[PDB]
Amino acid sequence: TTELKRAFRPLTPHINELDALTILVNLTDKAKCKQKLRDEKWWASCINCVNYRQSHNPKFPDIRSEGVIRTQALGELPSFLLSSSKIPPYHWSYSHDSKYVNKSAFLTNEFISCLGESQKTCKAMAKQLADITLTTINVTLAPNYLTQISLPDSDTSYISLSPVASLSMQSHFHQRLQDENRHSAITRFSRTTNMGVTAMTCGGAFRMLKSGAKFSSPPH
RNA sequence: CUGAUAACUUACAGGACGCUUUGGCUUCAUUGCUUUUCAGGUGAACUGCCGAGUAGGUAG
């Protein structure tokens, strides 16, 4: 049952339609008859979880920060550069809550598309349609824990920047560096359930990119 | 105007006990290094006395 749980989680590649949706209801619990139960309260909890699904995690280094980001990189950079626009943007995850990391598994596991994108079904679609709200940014720069960077834009002018970690990139460097032990540099983060769903998959070990061997110096 | 601004990882420790590597052995035949070769600066710092003197002193 763990190999079935790791597959719907975003740090594994993707994977009968009657079998799959009964799994996703049982993942929200902390059997085929537990799926047939339809609590009204359960639905509005899962509706909140598709709201706080995020493309890029503001709360990466610091778990006390607060924000929602569901955008795509603006424009396309040249071939000698690399960012989140070149890799296909679908490994997105859930944040903002520790109690609802299980209840987000119904509408955000994204078996490539996502389920979040009789009377209850009509009502559920209306909430999802009105509360999908594609491509939002909700940050307040007043009382939270963000980084702020001024760079000389154009001339005699500056722009403040706040870098945010990208979840499609973190899944890409983690999955590919399983084989290479030489170029991987594991960094561990505590309070894993507060971080997000994308940290609970790897357990805290994020598997960074280490620059080959040690530095040496020819006489130049 | 720097993933900006701020930042004490600390304490304690017995790896030990035991140990046969050995036996045998043919490196060996042959052999032409040869030919030719100016180191020069020496005009000069001499001639007497004393002394038993290959000793040792002094005169112009």
Please name the amino acid found at residue A58.
Answer: P
Please state whether strand B lies within 7 Å of residue A147 at its CB atom: yes
Please tell me what DSSP assigns to residue A182: S
Which nt sits closest to A59, CA to C1'? Answer: B3
Integer Cα distance of A113 and A109 in angstroms: 9
What was the experiment behind these coordinates? cryo-EM
Give Cβ neighbours of residue A188 (< 8 Å, ≥ 6 apart). Answer: A204, A205, A206
Please state whether strand B lies within 7 Å of residue A165 at its CB atom: yes
Chain B bases near protein Cβ (<7 Å): 1-5
Integer Cα distance of A39 and A43 in angstroms: 7
Cα-based angle A188, A83, A98 (whole degrees, multiple of 5): 40
Which nt sits closest to A60, CA to C1'? Answer: B3
- CA distance to A13, A37, A109, A182, per residue, from A8 (Å): 8, 22, 5, 29
> Can you give the distance from the CA of residue A214 to the C1' of nucleotide B31 in angstroms?
62
> Can you give the distance from the CA of residue A91 to the C1' of nucleotide B20 in angstroms?
69
Nearest to A141 by CA among A161, A158, A167: A161
Q: Which long-range contacts (CB under 8 A, 24 or more apart) does A143-148 make?
A: A144/A64, A144/A65, A144/A66, A144/A67, A145/A62, A145/A64, A145/A65, A146/A58, A146/A65, A146/A67
Resolution of this PDB entry, in A? 2.9
Asked if A42 contacts A29 with a C-beta cutoff of 8 angstroms, the reply is: no
Cα-based angle A49, A50, A53 (whole degrees, multiple of 5): 90
Integer Cα distance of A63 and A196 in angstroms: 9
Integer Cα distance of A195 and A62 in angstroms: 8
